Write a protein that binds this ligand. Structure first.
Ligand SMILES: C[C@H](O)[C@H](O)C1=Nc2c(nc(N)[nH]c2=O)NC1
Ligand SMILES: [Cl-]
Ligand SMILES: [Fe+3]
Length: 274
């Protein structure tokens, strides 16, 4: 007998596709309380991100008109997202298998957990919810180079076979799409979704002496461990989304397969550090 997780409780009486894990967005299951939780999260993040989020993120939020006051209707959002970027969101019950995830990204589908966090649980979150996925991840698709990066990432994941590739690709996604920073002429800014949807990470990642801030390096990153239950110990910094995009992985998985991974707090001899 155990504490059910929120994914299980939210999805009772609900089905999902056996192959691709999608379902129609269950609009009737958001409460008044949920729409208030959404508005509170949205308003809080939008006061923190001036000076912090990269310009492209802020542009996406505006161009997509992500709702400020209610959990968005995914079909309505998709009208704008498809026209502007060629991508669509699909509702998923929560975390889905890695192979299923890659197949969606490879086909310009972004999986979004449909349910929302409960009020006393507005942060420290580990599992995605609809605020993290829709507010954190989706707006950055307005940058076509980042969108193409995500599609390419997915196609690479579909193709990956070598033992050890899945952790390597998870680390790459984590230190870019979830927790990446970008150097800009106006100063260091944020692009990672796990930062942008979090009050605490948004502040910490640009205002703390403890973590390392390391220039992006693909092979380094694929061989670096990460932690889920704490603030990050290293952030990787890109100079441009083109650098990310410009980054066949098959020989790379083999080069790194027997390698000892770097710890989440380590500095490697070839790193460039801030
Ligand atoms: C990307 C890496 O494989 C990571 O373990 C995954 N992230 C996600 C996932 N599933 C969902 N719904 N969202 C994610 O962000 N499964 C796979
Ligand atoms: Cl491979
Ligand atoms: Fe995420």
């Amino acid at each position: 007998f155990v504490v059910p997780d929120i994914t299980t409780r939210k999805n009772v009486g609900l089905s999902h596709d056996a192959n691709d894990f999608t379902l129609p967005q269950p609009l009737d299951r958001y409460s008044a309380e949920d729409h208030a939780t959404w508005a509170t999260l949205y308003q809080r993040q939008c006061k923190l991100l001036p000076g912090r989020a990269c310009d492209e993120f802020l542009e996406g939020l505006e161009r997509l008109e992500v709702d400020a006051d209610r959990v968005p209707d995914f079909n309505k959002l998709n009208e704008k997202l498809m026209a502007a970027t060629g991508w669509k969101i699909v509702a998923v019950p929560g975390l889905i298998p890695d192979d299923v995830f890659f197949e969606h990204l490879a086909n310009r589908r972004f999986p979004v957990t449909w349910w929302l966090r409960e009020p006393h649980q507005l942060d420290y979150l580990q599992e995605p919810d609809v605020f993290h996925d829709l507010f954190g991840h989706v707006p950055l698709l307005i940058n076509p180079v980042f969108a193409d990066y995500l599609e390419a990432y997915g196609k690479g994941g579909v193709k990956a076979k070598a033992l050890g590739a899945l952790p390597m690709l998870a680390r790459l996604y984590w230190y870019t799409v979830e927790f990446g920073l970008i150097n800009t002429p106006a100063g260091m800014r944020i692009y990672g979704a796990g930062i942008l949807s979090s009050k605490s990470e948004s502040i910490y990642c640009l205002d703390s002496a403890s973590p390392n801030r390391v220039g992006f390096d693909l092979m380094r990153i694929m061989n670096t461990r990460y932690r889920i239950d704490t603030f990050q110990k290293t952030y990787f910094v890109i100079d441009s989304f083109k650098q990310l995009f410009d980054a066949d992985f098959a020989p790379l998985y083999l080069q790194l397969a027997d390698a000892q991974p770097w710890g989440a707090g380590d500095i490697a001899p070839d790193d460039l550090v801030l």
